[PDB]
Amino acid sequence: DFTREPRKIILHKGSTGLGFNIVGGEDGEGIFVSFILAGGPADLSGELRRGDRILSVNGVNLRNATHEQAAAALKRAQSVTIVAQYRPEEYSRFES
């Protein structure tokens, strides 16, 4: 992913959601994918990656979201349209 263009990713929830964990939104630093559950929707789609920043969900800007705002958006969303962008340098503040 040399351009680091954001990607539009369509996921459909199963019985236990989209199948990833979010980290961040503690201090204006944005919302990142920390964990992708094996055999959940996000995993099986293949598109989302650890260290993706979540830029938007169903048209809502999460760039400046708090953890709690992002959780609310993501939890309340069926067919969910995510815009994600690979940001390994920013993610390195979370995990080396």
Binding site: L18, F20, N21, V23, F35, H67, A70, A71, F94
Partner: peptide
């Protein structure tokens, strides 16, 4: 660090 399943 706290993380949240979605």
């Amino acid at each position: 660090x706290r993380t949240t399943p979605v």
